[PDB]
RNA sequence: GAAAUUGUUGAAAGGGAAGGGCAUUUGAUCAGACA
RNA sequence: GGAAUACUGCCAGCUGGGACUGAGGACUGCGACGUAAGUCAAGGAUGCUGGCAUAAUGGUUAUAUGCCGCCCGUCUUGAAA
RNA sequence: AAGCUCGUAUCAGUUUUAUGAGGUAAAGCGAAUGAUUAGAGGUUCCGGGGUCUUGACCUAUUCUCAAACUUUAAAUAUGUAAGAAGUCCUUGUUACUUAAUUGAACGUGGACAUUUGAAUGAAGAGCUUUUAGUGGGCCAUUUUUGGUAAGCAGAACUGGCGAUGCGGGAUGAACCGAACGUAGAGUUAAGGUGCCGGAAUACACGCUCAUCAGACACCACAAAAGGUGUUAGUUCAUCUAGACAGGAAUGAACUAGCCCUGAAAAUGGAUGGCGCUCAAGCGUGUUACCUAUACUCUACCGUCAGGGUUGAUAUGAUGCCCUGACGAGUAGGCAGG
RNA sequence: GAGAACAGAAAUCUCCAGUAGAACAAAAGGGUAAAAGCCCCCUUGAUUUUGAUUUUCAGUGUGAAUACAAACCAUGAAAGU
RNA sequence: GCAGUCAAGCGUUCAUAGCGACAUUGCUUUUUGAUUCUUCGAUGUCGGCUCUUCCUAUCAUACCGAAGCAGAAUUCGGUAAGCGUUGGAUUGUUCACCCACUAAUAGGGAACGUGAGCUGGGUUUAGACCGUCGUGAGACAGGUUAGUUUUACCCUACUGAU
């Protein structure tokens, strides 16, 4: 019959990296997680306790609870035609801080600095990002760069 | 369609590490500038590590025939794909302009070899400057001194359904 | 592609809108390439489109732009107070392009008067069809449909 | 007689008629599953500051 | 053909007129339709829409609720407006001297307001005194205290009231409600 | 004193079914305004 | 060395022929032309003229001609079967 | 279907920027595991004949592979973030925590407005109750399992038929175009323009002659192997210092276009039919033209939405009027008659 | 691989190399080297009281599993488990 | 089931008169399977008899090409379905096997042609017997014997007739 065990189809997902087996480095256990931090989930195959289910591999959530060796993460899961909130009790070895927003905090700091320096001098602070714009006009010189003519090559075998 | 010849000059996008990238030029036969620029990147991607997203078109200019009222013998080198394999061919076309010779070439390739536009690469078009350098007999026969030939069996065009006389084919 | 067409306000055949060219919008055009034809408008094309088939969106309704008073009453706060001011904000993509362009109702065009010029439309313009980017050639096509 | 076993055809189209709705977010979320010792002390901290204010 | 992003010919989903055939209620709707059109006062639009509500959407408002609202800071001299029925409440022993405008008053409610020195007026009398809702206070009764609401959303771990006729020891307290009998919800 | 079904008289069409839709010709028949 | 022309594009340049449509019903608006009075093609047709006033137009009905049209109801993935 | 709370508000079958996850395509085997061809150079008090061979190993190489092998590793799909529930400063509460007012959580007070934190759109957003029918499906492109195969059986994504007419494919539930209130005019789609049949017996360069030619996607079939039929092309040699045959070209080996051989079934027969041969066939290019219930403009009917108007003395405030958009439908629901 | 009376291809003893090519009750896939393997020492947490969460899922049950709270214990010098 | 391509070989010598290995490409729907689309408010079912027409992958007859064709006989191939292709013993048989004549006794289709045309021997209702199997009722694509074959006057087709 069919098999739908807890760790089914996880042959490669939970493997260690090549030449990266063994004990976990100490910086994993020294990081500090607080309620409200954004973390991403990546199960470590050598730690069988506090291991997330395979569905949450590669998912990002928000910490809501902090315990002795584990944290609680909030995950929104799409079930049917709606999203339901899932609460996971995961050990710290299976998570890490998310860099998707640490850079955003830098832009928040930079916006305030540019907002303040323009507060006394210039109107229209212009603190909004823009997408890539079409290129402006330019002049290309041929001094030492005379164009060289190219032609299609004939067919050859060279086997 | 009625082909026109363009020159297209392109370059890689300038970078901080490598400024003033080299300029590359080629002559393209196409119906309009939109097709010509498309063909330029098609051949460039077969020769250099570059594509449209990492390049820029510098200049596109129409090239006119220097002597559009002089009969010339053109030598044409082509590469085309058949139903099984790729082949190189040499053909000779007699006309007054390069664009007219190229249009004849595409018609000839489609008629005799069933080769579409997408399957043909024009390697080189050049004018045979000297007589006795023509090496195809279907072109040499028109180079004879004081060439003359009639047009037997003339067929006239009628604008009416019915005719009141038996037509003649004299000329 | 169906979603992108809705976001560009193209819900029926022979409808047209103006689009500002950025990296965020060029990727939208590649997704709907086999369903649209687009190019670079000229001043005459923009002028004739607005004068003949220019309608404004007022209170969720389609109102003809038959006088400068209605334009001022709806776009005056952006400095636009005439039909030529609206045209200027479009051809030169100004600070208020988004508001001026969204004010215009999507253009309802007819079929081309001399036909499409090709036996089959649903190929790329490069391959002898109709869809894709035809650059400055869009002006001829639009004027026959306007 | 035999019949079809399983298919997901037309299921996504049904889900997009009214569904695919993100959850509504609330400030002051539920404290269910939070550490009981933290909640026990957090209750006393709120009582003290209410008297002060 | 048009690619429609939304349903066509869709009604607004809000009542534009009362469902009742009360001739006197229609007169009040006609009065406040005129006022809402020609006053640009937010009060008149609220009152007009409240006249369209059904019975369950207009819960009764007791006099004790009125007295509590008058205890708000700066609301002692405001006119209480209830689009519905005001009932009596004997649990309170002191009542202010306010003015109350409502569609209906019970016998106990009217007597209690008048005995305290206040007055009970209709909605058309309110319109003459306050055409733009000057110095008014709108009070609404509780909708979720209705007996039908407690059965809505029934299901596992929802804590709702089951729809049952007889309540007792032998009525839906067995397996499914306690751990000693199979499981608990 | 209805219909199925039938006789007589009258009109019309008919080269291996009949019946129908859009449009007009021909025959028959008929209402409305003469302000 | 100096022009012409082709091709492509623009004109708030001018002008001839043909077809379909006339919704609305005191005034109100925005413009144009004028020193002005006023006028106008400016928020939807008016002016002039002829024949007939009845089966002439039109309606109904039978027939003819051109093109099209398979038997309804039902179960069914699928019915003229 | 009934609505309810509100109305600029957050949202989105989408992109962008930033940051994650994956082990399929491909690739790899002088990288691990498992298969696998060929020798070469060495090694035995430790295989066995023979005084030197055949096996075993080891070292450097070599040919070829993997749904249940792998270092590397895409494309397409996929998670999160892009602010007021935010950032910054100062200091209040606690029985939690710290060697320690240390920290953690929640707050008081002060400052920073909508180029307030990318793009585009937004027939408004949010929410609740109740109930119908359905719970045999099938088809097409792409991915894909079993099977020689099947108009066979079974999955994945999307679009369709069922529930759907209309123009085209002669004819057809699914293909192409396009979806439908009643009409008028104009322009087109796919497909076509010798006649049937509305529209060029149009223009241009070639190819093909079949005593079983050919003629348009899905689609109603043809192969290996051959031809001094004819056309174009590749390479080599001979030839002005006269080749080949017996006075200018010739020989050999190959390549692929059309045609031909290969090609046999039962009532009489079907590029749709007639017929068509510098085509009315095949390949390709340029214009003109024909016509859908599609597109543009106008009228009328209905539906929905946003608005105007109670003033008496003339009758319907469920009245009258202004503006914009919309119209397919089985099972089924509701409304007005 | 190189060594030691009986002793040999395999008895016991010694050294060198050895990323796991071993072992971990069982099918297979993961994981693991001063260990999760081997040997030795001490133990009963395979305990008590009830909740929350994950997987199958209707977000029902059952099975299994994860992280705490309140007790009582085992082990260790200890952090811890 | 039938027909090709290649040519190691057979054929005294000699690949291809006639054959042909190892491989490989097809055709046919007169074999049998695979499938379950049509029919369970029913399309009468095996064989034979009778009778017509069609297909060619040609057994005979006409005219030819080829041979390891002297003649005689025979073999291979082409154009050809115009014209013929039988009488019997055993079996319900299709099939098969013999006897004999003959120029020859070729292979097939037409709802595996043909039951309101016949016939009813077989298969496949109810009676009965045997063997094996089953405690038994009973089972057996094992054997044996006995067992109702209905209607055309309508339309069309066909044959004749006004
Ligand atoms: Cl399905
Ligand atoms: Cl007719
Ligand atoms: Cl038995
Ligand atoms: Mg035209
Ligand atoms: Mg076309
Ligand atoms: Mg009587
Ligand atoms: Mg009768
Ligand atoms: Mg008439
Ligand atoms: Mg017909
Ligand atoms: Mg069926
Ligand atoms: Mg039917
Ligand atoms: Mg996998
Ligand atoms: Mg692979
Ligand atoms: Mg059905
Ligand atoms: Mg067809
Ligand atoms: Mg015609
Ligand atoms: Mg042609
Ligand atoms: Mg409808
Ligand atoms: Mg089936
Ligand atoms: Mg029957
Ligand atoms: Mg019968
Ligand atoms: Mg019968
Ligand atoms: Mg039969
Ligand atoms: Mg019978
Ligand atoms: Mg019969
Ligand atoms: Mg019998
Ligand atoms: Mg019997």
> Does residue C66 reach within 7 angstroms of strand H, measured from its CB?
no
Q: Is B89 within 8 Å of chain A by CB?
A: no
Q: Which residues of C touch E3 (CB under 8 A)?
A: 2, 5-6, 11-12
Residue to mutate among B5, B8, B26, with most A CBs inside 10 A, is B26
Q: Which single residue is written with the structure tokens 């010792």? A: D37
Q: Look at C12 and E2 and tell me if their CB atoms are within 8 Å.
A: yes
For residues A50 and A43, what is the distance between their CA atoms, to the nearest angstrom?
9
Say whether both B83 and B39 belong to one domain.
no
Same-domain pairing of B54 and B78: no
Distance D18 CA to ligand 6 centre (A): 71
Experimental method: cryo-EM
Q: Is residue B14 part of a domain?
A: yes
- In a shared domain, residues B83 and B56: no
Question: Which residues of chain A lie closer than 8 angstroms to D16, CB-CB?
Answer: 81
Q: Which residue is nearest to nucleotide H190 (CA to C1')?
A: C120
C12, E4: Cβ pair inside 8 Å? no
Cα–Cα distances in angstroms (integers) from residue C111 to residues A35, B95, C34, C116, in the given order: 61, 41, 18, 8
Cα–Cα separations (whole angstroms), residue E3 to C37, E6, E26, E37? 18, 9, 42, 37
**CB within 8 Å: A132 and C22:** yes
| Chain B CB within 8 Å of residue C23 CB | no
The angstrom resolution of this structure is: 2.2
Query: Taking a C-beta distance cutoff of 8 angstroms, is the pair C22, A131 a contact?
Result: yes
Nearest by CB to residue A140, choosing from B58, B79, B122, is B58
Listed residues: CB within 5 A of ion ligand 5: C 119
Which among E171, B31, D24, D6 has a CA at the least distance from the CA of C125? B31
Q: Is the CB of E159 under 7 A from strand I?
A: no
The answer to whether residue B118 is domain-embedded is yes
> Distance from the CA of E1 to the center of ligand 9, in angstroms?
30
- D partners (3+ CB pairs within 8 A) are A
Q: Provide the residue range defining the domain that includes B123.
A: 69-145
Compute, in angstroms, the gap from residue C114 CA to the centroid of ligand 4. 7
DSSP state of C106: P
Instruction: Pick the closest to residue E117 from E140, E100, E92, E103 (CA basis).
Output: E100
What tokens does C85 get?
Answer: 């001011």
CA of B111 to the centre of ligand 5 (A): 24
> In this structure, are residues D20 and A81 in contact, taking their beta carbons and an 8 Å threshold?
yes
Cβ of A86 near strand I (distance < 7 A):
yes
Query: B32: which chain C residues are within 8 Å (Cβ-Cβ)?
Result: 137
Question: Which string of DSSP letters, residue by residue, matches chain A?
Answer: -----TTTT-TTTTPPPTT--SSPPTHHHH----TT-EEEE---TT--TTPPPGGGTT-EEEEEEE-SSEEEEEEEEEETTEEEEEEEEEEGGGEEE-TTTHHHHHHHHHHHHHHHHHHSS-S--------PPPPPP-----TT---EE--PPPP----
CA–CA distance, B78 with E77 (Å, rounded to integer):
100
Residues of C in contact with A133 (CB under 8 A): 22-23
> Residue C5: CB partners within 8 Å, gap ≥ 6?
C11, C32, C35, C36, E3
Please give the Cα distance from B9 to B12 (Å, whole number): 11
Residue A88 and residue A40 in contact, taking contact as beta carbons nearer than 8 Å: no
What is the SS3 string spanning chain E?
CCCCCCCCCCCCCCCCCCCCCCHHHHHHHHHHHHHHHCCCCHHHHHHHHHCCCCCCCCCCEEHHHHHHHHCCCCCCCCEEEEEEEEECCCCCCCCCCCEEEEEEECHHHHHHHHHCCCEEECHHHHHHHCCCCCCEEECCCCCCCCCCHHHCCCCCCCCCCCCCCCCCCCCCCCCEECCCCCCEC
CA-to-CA separations, B64 to A62, B3, B6, B26, B98, in angstroms, rounded: 68, 12, 9, 15, 9
From the list B25, B43, B47, which residue is nearest A147 (CB)? B25
Nearest Cα to B51, choosing from B62, B42, B63?
A: B42
Give the domain-ending residue among B68, B84, B112. Answer: B68
B51 and B117 housed in the same domain: no
Q: Tell me if chain A has a CB within 8 Å of the CB of D20.
A: yes
**Dist. CA A27 → ligand 23 center (Å):** 89
Six token digits for residue B66: 């220097």
> Are A81 and D23 in contact (CB < 8 Å)?
no
Q: Tell me the domains of chain E and their CATH numbers.
A: 14-145 (3.100.10.10)
Q: Is residue D28 classed exposed, middle or buried when 0-12, 13-18 and 19+ CB atoms within 10 A define those classes?
A: exposed
Chain A residue whose CA is closest to B125:
A151
- CB spacing of D35 vs A67 below 8 angstroms: yes
Write down the domain spans for chain C: 1-146
- Separation between Cα atoms, residue C23 and residue A13, nearest integer Å: 35
Whether residue B74 is found in the same domain as residue B41: no
b (16+ CB within 10 A) / e for A21-59:
eeeeeeeeeeeebeeebebbbebbeeeeebbbeeebeeb
Dihedral angle of Cα C78, C84, C87, C91, to the nearest 10 degrees: -100
Please tell me the distance from the alpha carbon of residue D14 to that of residue E58, in angstroms, as a whole number.
37
Distance CA E107, CA E116 (A): 15
Do residue B18 and residue B80 come from a single domain? no
Q: CB pairs below 8 Å between A and D: how many?
A: 31
Q: What is the CATH number of the domain that holds B139?
A: 3.10.20.10
For residue C67, the SS3 value is coil
Same domain, B77 and B56: no
Which nucleotides in chain G lie closer than 7 A to a protein CB?
A: 8-12, 30
Q: Which of B22, B41, B68 is the last residue before a domain boundary?
A: B68
Dihedral angle at the C-alpha atoms of B83, B89, B94, B100, nearest 10 degrees?
50
Work out how many domains chain B is built from and give that number: 2
Does B56 share its domain with B97?
Answer: no
Q: Which nucleotide is nearest to E31 (CA to C1')?
A: H310
């Amino acid at each position: 019959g069919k098999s739908h065990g807890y760790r089914s189809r996880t042959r490669y997902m939970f493997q260690r990296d090549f030449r990266k087996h063994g004990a976990v480095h100490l910086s994993t256990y020294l990081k500090v997680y607080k309620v409200g931090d954004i973390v991403d989930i990546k199960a470590n195959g050598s730690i069988q306790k506090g291991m997330p289910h395979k569905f949450y591999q590669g998912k990002t959530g928000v910490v809501y609870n902090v315990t002795k060796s584990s944290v609680g993460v909030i995950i929104n899961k799409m079930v049917g035609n709606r999203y339901l909130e899932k609460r996971l009790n995961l050990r710290v070895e299976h998570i890490k801080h998310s860099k998707c927003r640490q850079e955003f905090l830098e832009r928040v700091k930079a916006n305030a600095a540019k907002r303040a320096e323009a507060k006394a001098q210039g109107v229209a602070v212009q603190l909004k990002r823009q997408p890539a714009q079409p290129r402006e006009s330019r002049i290309v010189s041929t001094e030492g760069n005379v164009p060289q003519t190219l032609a299609p090559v004939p067919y050859e075998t060279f086997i | 369609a009625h082909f026109k010849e363009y020159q297209v000059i392109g370059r890689r996008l300038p970078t901080e590490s490598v400024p003033e990238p080299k300029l590359f030029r080629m002559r393209i036969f196409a119906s309009n500038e939109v097709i010509a620029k498309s063909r330029y990147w098609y051949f460039l991607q077969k020769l250099h590590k570059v594509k449209k997203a990492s390049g820029e078109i510098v200049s596109i200019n129409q090239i006119n025939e220097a002597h559009p009222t002089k009969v010339k013998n053109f030598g044409v080198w082509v590469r085309y794909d058949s139903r099984s394999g790729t082949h190189n061919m040499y053909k000779e076309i007699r006309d007054v302009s390069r664009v007219a010779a190229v249009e004849t070439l595409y018609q000839d390739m489609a008629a005799r070899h069933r080769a579409r536009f997408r399957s043909i690469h024009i390697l080189k078009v050049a004018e045979i400057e000297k007589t006795a350098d023509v090496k195809r007999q279907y072109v040499k026969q028109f180079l004879t001194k004081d060439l003359k030939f009639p047009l037997p069996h003339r067929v006239q065009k009628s604008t009416k359904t019915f005719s009141y006389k038996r037509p003649s084919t004299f000329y | 592609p169906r979603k992108v067409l809705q976001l560009l306000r193209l819900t029926r055949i022979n409808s047209g809108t103006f689009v500002k060219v950025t990296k965020a919008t060029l990727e939208l055009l590649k997704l709907i390439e086999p369903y649209v034809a687009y190019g670079y408008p000229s001043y005459s094309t923009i002028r004739q489109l607005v004068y003949k088939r220019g309608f404004g969106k007022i209170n969720k309704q389609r109102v003809p732009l038959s006088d400068n008073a209605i334009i001022e009453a709806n776009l005056g706060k952006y400095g636009i107070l005439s039909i030529d001011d609206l045209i200027h904000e479009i051809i030169t993509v100004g600070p208020h392009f988004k508001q001026a362009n969204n004010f215009l109702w999507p253009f309802k065009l007819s079929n081309p008067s001399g036909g499409w010029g090709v036996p089959r439309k649903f190929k790329h313009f490069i391959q002898g069809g109709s869809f894709g980017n035809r650059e400055e050639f869009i002006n001829k096509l639009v004027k026959s449909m306007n | 007689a035999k019949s079809k076993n399983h298919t997901a055809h037309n299921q996504t189209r049904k889900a997009h008629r009214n569904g695919i709705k993100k959850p509504k977010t609330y400030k002051y979320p539920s404290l269910k599953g939070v550490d009981p010792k933290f909640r026990r002390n957090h209750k006393h901290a709120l009582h003290g500051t209410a008297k002060a204010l | 053909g048009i690619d429609h992003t939304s349903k066509q010919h869709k009604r607004s989903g809000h009542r534009t007129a009362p469902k009742s055939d009360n001739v006197y209620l229609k007169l009040l709707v006609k009065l406040y339709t005129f006022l809402a059109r020609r006053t640009d006062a937010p009060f008149n639009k609220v009152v007009l829409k409240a006249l369209f509500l059904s019975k369950i959407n207009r819960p009764p408002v007791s006099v004790s609720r009125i007295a509590r609202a008058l205890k708000q800071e700066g609301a002692a001299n405001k006119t209480v407006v209830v689009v519905g029925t005001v009932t009596d409440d004997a649990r309170i022993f002191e009542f202010p001297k306010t003015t109350v405008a409502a569609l209906r008053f019970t016998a106990g409610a009217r007597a209690k307001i008048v005995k305290a020195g206040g007055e009970c007026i209709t909605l058309d009398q309110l319109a003459v005194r306050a055409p733009k809702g000057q110095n008014t206070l709108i009070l609404r009764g509780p909708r979720n205290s209705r007996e039908a609401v407690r059965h809505f959303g029934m299901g596992p771990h929802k804590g709702k009231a089951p729809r049952i006729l007889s309540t007792g020891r032998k009525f839906e307290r067995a397996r499914g409600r306690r751990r000693s009998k199979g499981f608990k919800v």
